[PDB]
Design a protein around this ligand. Sequence first.
Ligand SMILES: [Ca+2]
Ligand SMILES: [Ca+2]
Ligand SMILES: [Ca+2]
Ligand SMILES: [Ca+2]
Ligand SMILES: [Ca+2]
Ligand SMILES: [Ca+2]
Ligand SMILES: [Ca+2]
Ligand SMILES: [Ca+2]
Ligand SMILES: [Ca+2]
Ligand SMILES: [Ca+2]
Ligand SMILES: [Ca+2]
Ligand SMILES: [Ca+2]
Ligand SMILES: [Ca+2]
Lengths: 173, 177, 174, 178, 176, 176, 178, 178, 174, 173, 177
Amino acid sequence: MIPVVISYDIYSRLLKDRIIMLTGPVEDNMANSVIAQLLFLDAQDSTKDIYLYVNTPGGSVSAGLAIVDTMNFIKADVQTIVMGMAASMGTVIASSGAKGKRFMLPNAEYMIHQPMAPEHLLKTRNTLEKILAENSGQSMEKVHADAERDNWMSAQETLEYGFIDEIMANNSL
Amino acid sequence: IPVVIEQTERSYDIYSRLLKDRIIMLTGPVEDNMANSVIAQLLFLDAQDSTKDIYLYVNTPGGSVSAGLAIVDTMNFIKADVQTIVMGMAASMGTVIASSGAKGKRFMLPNAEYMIHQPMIAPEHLLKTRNTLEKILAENSGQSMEKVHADAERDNWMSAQETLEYGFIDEIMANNS
Amino acid sequence: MIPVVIERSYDIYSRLLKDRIIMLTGPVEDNMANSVIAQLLFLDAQDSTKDIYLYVNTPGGSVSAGLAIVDTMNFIKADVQTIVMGMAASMGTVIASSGAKGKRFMLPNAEYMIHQPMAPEHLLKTRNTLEKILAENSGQSMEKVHADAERDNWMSAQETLEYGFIDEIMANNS
Amino acid sequence: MIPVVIEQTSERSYDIYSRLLKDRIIMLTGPVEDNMANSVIAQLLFLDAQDSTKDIYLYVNTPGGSVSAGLAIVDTMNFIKADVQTIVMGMAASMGTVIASSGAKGKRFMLPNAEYMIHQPMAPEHLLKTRNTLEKILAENSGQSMEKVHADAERDNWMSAQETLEYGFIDEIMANNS
Amino acid sequence: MIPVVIEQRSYDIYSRLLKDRIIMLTGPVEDNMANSVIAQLLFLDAQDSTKDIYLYVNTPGGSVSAGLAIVDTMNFIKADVQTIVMGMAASMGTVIASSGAKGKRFMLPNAEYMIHQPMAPEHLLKTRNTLEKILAENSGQSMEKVHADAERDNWMSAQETLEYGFIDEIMANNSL
Amino acid sequence: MIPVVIEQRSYDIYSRLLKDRIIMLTGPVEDNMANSVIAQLLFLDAQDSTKDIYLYVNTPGGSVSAGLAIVDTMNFIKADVQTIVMGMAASMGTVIASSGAKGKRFMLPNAEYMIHQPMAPEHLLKTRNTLEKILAENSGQSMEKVHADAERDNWMSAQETLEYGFIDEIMANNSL
Amino acid sequence: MIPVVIEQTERSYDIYSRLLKDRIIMLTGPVEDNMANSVIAQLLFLDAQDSTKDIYLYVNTPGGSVSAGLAIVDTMNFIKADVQTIVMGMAASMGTVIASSGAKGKRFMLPNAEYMIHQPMIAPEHLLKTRNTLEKILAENSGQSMEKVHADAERDNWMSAQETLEYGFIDEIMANNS
Amino acid sequence: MIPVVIEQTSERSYDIYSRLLKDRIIMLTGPVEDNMANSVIAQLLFLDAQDSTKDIYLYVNTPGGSVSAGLAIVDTMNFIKADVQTIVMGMAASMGTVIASSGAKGKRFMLPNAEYMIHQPMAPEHLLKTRNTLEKILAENSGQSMEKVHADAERDNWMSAQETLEYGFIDEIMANNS
Amino acid sequence: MIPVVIERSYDIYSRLLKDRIIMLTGPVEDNMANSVIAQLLFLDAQDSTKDIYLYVNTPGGSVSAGLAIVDTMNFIKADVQTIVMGMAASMGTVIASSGAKGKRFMLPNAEYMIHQPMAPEHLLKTRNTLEKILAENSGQSMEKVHADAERDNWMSAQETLEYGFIDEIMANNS
Amino acid sequence: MIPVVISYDIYSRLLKDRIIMLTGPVEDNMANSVIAQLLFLDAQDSTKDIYLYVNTPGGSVSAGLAIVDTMNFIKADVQTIVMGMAASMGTVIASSGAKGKRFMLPNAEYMIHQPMAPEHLLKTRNTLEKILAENSGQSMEKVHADAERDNWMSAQETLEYGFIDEIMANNSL
Amino acid sequence: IPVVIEQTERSYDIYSRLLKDRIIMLTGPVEDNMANSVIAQLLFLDAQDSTKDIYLYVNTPGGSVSAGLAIVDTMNFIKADVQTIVMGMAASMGTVIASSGAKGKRFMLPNAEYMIHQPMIAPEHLLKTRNTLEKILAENSGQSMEKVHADAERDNWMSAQETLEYGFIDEIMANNS
Ligand SMILES: [Ca+2]
Ligand SMILES: [Ca+2]
Ligand SMILES: [Ca+2]
Ligand SMILES: [Ca+2]
Ligand SMILES: [Ca+2]
Ligand SMILES: [Ca+2]
Ligand SMILES: [Ca+2]
Ligand SMILES: [Ca+2]
Ligand SMILES: [Ca+2]
Ligand SMILES: [Ca+2]
Ligand SMILES: [Ca+2]
Ligand SMILES: [Ca+2]
Ligand SMILES: [Ca+2]
């Protein structure tokens, strides 16, 4: 464990203040840690916001969509904050945050391409694209068309597209 | 392993703090070791208070039949009703487990997927066990065993909507937004 | 094997964190970078008016993670002093450079390397972004930085002060 | 297998190294690299913050290692106003000698059967630059000429405790009191 | 960690013995275990340097450098360090054990002892001379004869070892 | 190489059969074995394209790309390529075997057949459509029904396979 | 490693190919696709050379792959040439199905060889059908009820040359000529 | 398992590929890299030395690979005055397409179920330079605009045999004569 | 899997050796380098008056082995033409460059890289030795070569002809 | 095998003309191949010279000294030719060639440091130094003193020291 | 594996061309596989012509006692005298083998080294075998077995000069220059 007082992580201090770090590739283990943290924070107080910092290259669709259904299901609004990068399921997750409370760091980048029986994979990619469309107010056909490209979007581009609501300040100037 | 502190200064991990609220996390492949943890958790909560419900969240690809069935039998033995919430996916033994949750109280998240195919010592043993898993599946859902046997003989992923239709869950959980 | 101070049982890095010190060591990659960030966010919430002291000793590494440190440093109100010890290369200088003006130090024997190693068009956009940050942090031109960085060229502390990546070289008090 | 020590107060529990850290003892052990160095430097910064007037005891037993990690230790030792004593046990080789010899003057010790080698093993023109730097520190630390240190360092001989006193890298050999 | 007790990481059997000034030096001699041993020796001495220390030794041998750091530390501290050989002591093992406070070096009766030290060649010869010198200082036998006997791979019974001078008493079989 | 004969590397049992226009396609379908098979097919055709070729097939399946290169090469050359299934034919196996000159596709009586083809998803679906199309062309059955039966993991006896249309005759048990 | 021999017409043959000229094939080790495709290759060769001359197939295997074993049996049964079998050392599982499918009257076994007709074994209904087939073949080859072969094949017991004769799986035990 | 072919003369022995090399057939197979390329180029240089007026048949089946190894093949094909025909079988991807499309004009074929992908997977500013080069060759080879090829190459779709005729990378699809 | 021509059974590289062609591929290291040398020594003994054609396609590698090829080329009387195909970097250009004057070719799409990557004083003596050879082979100054080589800079065939590392770019005859 | 006619190496062609390549690290296997080649060439004609090309970083002392005793023992003079480098036992071998017939390529380098029970290793290093002294006409004390350094010698330096007799020409000028 | 061609066109490797001149190369660790090659070579030469000598060059660290002794017994059984030439080193079984060469005809190169220590199933077997190897060593050299046993109980490397003194070889081979 890293910065440790006594087992008591730096991350566990941030959790007292309702913050959750989503970090590294999304696979079942970290997803269930994030999910447990959400059900816990909801149960403590379903009326205070939760702040879900996201920095992931992506990964498992099943685990990522489980975090997402968990997010939607808990009454508490889950703000999301992209830092460094969100790709693959990282964009599905981050964009599914509460409309008006989705943020992003200025130098971070965003990537909505979803790399994946094949009949089923195609269905899943459609559900995933459907969701990015609902999250951005954009048309499904636009998202499908934009996603098949392997282009990274700036925070400015991600804002104009609708996946987020404000880019974080450079409070040093 | 994030950590939650309570004051009066003692220190749970997050899964343990949920267990104080009677939540259990059945996650990853079903094998003996994680199945024992779940079974000990179940026995412990029931003894602590057999009136309150237990909430078993299931996100699993399946795994050993033996270990899954020990989980089922424990859920069925203890007095406390075991709700099951399928998140992510429930494949093979996953569905045997989640569907054996107390009827009226089997939930699934909107985007979870389901799979009742049961992949599989002697061949006539494998048959008996596979009929047994289908036999439980059929009882759980309200369907005939012939029905279950032909639909478990394909690699059909089921949506939550299809899972409710078929009878393995009672309720799709909501999206609040 | 990380030592412990009772005050109740801090590890040596947690103890230094009470005094608002964060250590940044080894290669910059997602996990260590997400740790430094969690400490910065934690420290900013504790007190936004008090300065944070960030020691920096790294060969560099991932642009994504390192640019997450820079942004977090910039996002929080609390000024982030940076102390370079041993070395700072590649992303390490982008981070150390981005300390609050006047509050960027370096130990006498440390070394600096502003070279940034690395989808082709995308790589070229990322390198322009880093060289732009380094120019703003040094009061130098983008053309000067671009030329100095395509050398593999180590810089003493004196040289690094002249360039203006730091503000003060710290003492040899013995 | 790190033994712990129970002290009874108001009951606390230290591993042995952390117990020694209460008496301002740091253990520089094994190869020098970015992690163990970071740990040493953190201990140095802590102790000094507690009390700049009480000394620090750095026991040294290393084959040497990374030049940049070693120079970060050296530079922390010099930056903190607290005097850092060095005690070479077993061996100090290469970066271990630049470290040990930078201990406060008059307070650099070495066990009798320990050994010392000041050779500094090494992109071309940079390697030359750091080697001059390392030899320059070794020279200032021993009151010798850099010319001299350059000659001796390259010849890959080990020095006994006695020879290392004669050279100027330590100030005292600790005794055989038993 | 084994077998353990947590507090009113954990308080294992070696930490409990260490409370009675008992240090256990086992397995091959290398830098990590030697640094643990040296830190234990400096600790105990700091607490009371008029009280003996009991160093149990069971080791195939290993690093000369680390073994000599253990030996010099034993000799630096004013507290006497008794040594007890159990099972085997070989190479740096013997150099370490035979350096126990004179009068207070013991061996178990079926333990075995081997003074052979397997090893740039000018430097290997030099450290070997140091070890053989120390062995002779500890035993009361001449360097020439220590050198002769180490150049062979014979194990020594506790009786051969006491007669040689590396130990002071064999511990008894007390079921007799 | 096995069992071999050197000359008046060596002349192994497969080279000897190849003299009688017999090609053996075995193990998983991958690029190296497929290139050997294609080179054999082009060789034999060049020597005499009016003389049949006998391609023995025993394979779990494998690379679609390589399997389709074997199939197109069979079809390009004017020489008819008889195919004989032995042991098993699965996936690209069946696609390859069922593409034998019509009238001249055989199977051993205890051999087994499996038309399921395990597999960017738009492209995986596309190649799967190609295979299923070919299976239907070779069998005389509809794509719909080929698609239905391939979506299941059932092995087929030589009798089920002849009735389905992938083969033309089952070879006899001649010890009767 | 395996040695070489010359024959006249001036040609090298490895010992196995020399034995092939006498229509002898050697089947040894676990039944898997490589060795089984090699035995089949050989059997096709002999059939192309002369479809009426007898073939002599030596068998020493603990069994293995069902698909590849049945490929051999079927190739043996397809070609009109009588395939004689000689079990040596052991024949177990597919080995007994292979050896017992030799031409009636021409299945042999060495006096200390051992037989074992138990068949161990991807979907489960298919595995059951496959085992029926194997016992069906064993029944035919021995002239016994499938019922009896089922019971006897469950046991996992080892038969001697003489017990293999009594069962009907072989026709003659070969002599000790000393 | 490379079969050999015996021809009787005055008795010689070719592996199948070397036998095909007598008819001026070369097999470009597997990933493109420095070794298999060297072998191809050596075959190209040999055949051409024998007779500059007889054509060369390069069958192609590769996932692509090294750009410099591929461009060495391409440049040998163009340097030798002998016309090199290309036949894509199975697949040609990436460097395999730059190679195949540089076959003599009118003599570039492709099997019906084969597939073609002209995406060229990629130190920064150099990678841009070679990608322009590769697209420039692809453009000249297909009579298309480079703008066009740049658009289509980056979109990572596969092309059927028919589509590849429509594009200009081949001249003929070989038939299903059976 | 190296093809064969009967003439009695040459492998494709031995057959080309009858025509005095040697191929130089992959990384330059002791074993392949000792092979090329054995071929050069063999070919020189066969006829010292006839030219040898050396094809060169390599990323570079060991200085010792590569400098053994250069010396062997220089030691034998028979002129050694060098044909660069694909690429020649680092030691590969020292070798290709050292072909006989007028007889140093390059295929149109090949690339050149004169950078030479690498006991510190010794490394610096070796790099001066290589840069000195490259200067003599190109008719350029040691200062020019030294500056151009500390870039990581790929050269087209045109650029390489201008520099004077080759004499002719060979045709695209299609 | 490399440039192959028929098993028949490029190296085996050079051997018809009495040339032997010594290459890679000297260990027992390659040493016994070199030794077999020497006894063969001696037996064919003990009056024609043998040409031993050497390019080795060094290695096993026992195997290297076996090549050397073999060289001295066969009546035929063994010329040696250093190319690329000779280090450790490579210098013992190369320098033990017939006095007046030891050659070296102009850019090759040479290294007489001999890196190695310790009492025995020291004896072996002395025998090795003894031999380099006999081979160069230099004093043993000079060789010992020069060898403990890890310095590489030029062909010019190696000539002035006496380990060789002529540096090969650059016949391109 | 360099190759030698003879003309009348047939092609030996170098070790095989030496074998035509009755030379055998016992090299590397003594194990069963290389020992068989040597034994086949020995049997083959003796049958071809039992009057001419065989020249066994030995450069070996030692190895299996079993396999070495099979080599010795073959050298001693066949009629043709087996000269042995120690080059590089001869340790353990190496020395048992080389010293069992036909007396008068055991050679060693000037710089070769020798080692009769024999490093070593049940302990009383190891003893019998070790006495047997010493017993052969003693017979070979002309020394008593007590002598051999105490000198084989050290890690003494022997020079050629010491090896001639002691009796394991007949002649140090010359340096011509
Ligand atoms: Ca919510
Ligand atoms: Ca809301
Ligand atoms: Ca219940
Ligand atoms: Ca700030
Ligand atoms: Ca003491
Ligand atoms: Ca004494
Ligand atoms: Ca056809
Ligand atoms: Ca049809
Ligand atoms: Ca038959
Ligand atoms: Ca020349
Ligand atoms: Ca000679
Ligand atoms: Ca002479
Ligand atoms: Ca004899």
